[PDB]
């Protein structure tokens, strides 16, 4: 049951609006002085561990999204909100990369105001002209 302490401490770091010493946390959070509370802060990406004494602080978006897609080259899907959390206010950058048609975005089939962003592995008249009717002998005649 070590998962809850990190969130009550971090949301407290948001409420206090300033970094809190591990001892100040352990006294305010009334815990035995321990490395695990710091280690959860060393583990958690929403909190910054400071090399000077104790200090714990709470915690380029288009480039970050492009790097995430490149790392994602093995992954065929990602979550929209998680990318936004990694790069705060990345939904707009994701939509812009979409409009550019590179990191392209996929408009929400659930709530039409939302949009998902996806990772890039990198008209019906036009489409039917590009498709029409779709055999082997005309292909050989084509070949």
């Amino acid at each position: 049951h070590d998962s809850s302490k990190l969130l009550w401490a971090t949301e407290y770091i948001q409420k206090k609006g300033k970094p809190v010493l591990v001892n100040e946390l352990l006294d305010y959070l009334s815990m035995k002085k321990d490395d695990k509370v710091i280690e959860l802060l060393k583990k958690l990406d929403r909190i910054e561990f400071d090399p000077k004494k104790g200090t714990f602080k709470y915690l380029h978006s288009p480039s970050e999204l492009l790097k995430l897609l490149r790392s994602q080259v093995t992954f065929k899907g990602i979550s929209c909100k998680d990318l936004k959390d990694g790069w705060p206010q990345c939904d707009e950058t994701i939509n812009q990369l979409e409009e550019d048609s590179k990191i392209l975005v996929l408009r929400t089939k659930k709530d039409k105001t939302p949009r998902y962003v996806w990772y890039n592995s990198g008209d019906e008249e036009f489409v039917k002209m590009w498709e029409n009717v779709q055999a082997e002998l005309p292909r050989k005649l084509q070949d």
Partner: protein, 64 residues
């Protein structure tokens, strides 16, 4: 904090058992449990949450 002590006391429990204890709507109980506990929908214990310091968590709850 009390519900967590139940989770060490019981590896499996229900929103009904929790609502009976906490006298709160199961919907609220289901939200926080998603954070601490996870649900198993298969087996004899199906539809019951299983866990993954407790005193530190209780003091954190008291602070917040």
């Amino acid at each position: 904090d009390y519900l967590f002590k139940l989770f060490d006391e019981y590896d499996y429990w229900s929103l009904k058992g929790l609502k009976e204890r906490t006298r709160q709507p199961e919907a609220h109980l289901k939200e926080c449990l998603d954070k601490v506990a996870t649900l198993v929908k298969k087996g004899p214990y199906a539809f019951k949450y299983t866990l993954r310091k407790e005193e530190e968590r209780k003091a954190t709850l008291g602070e917040l």
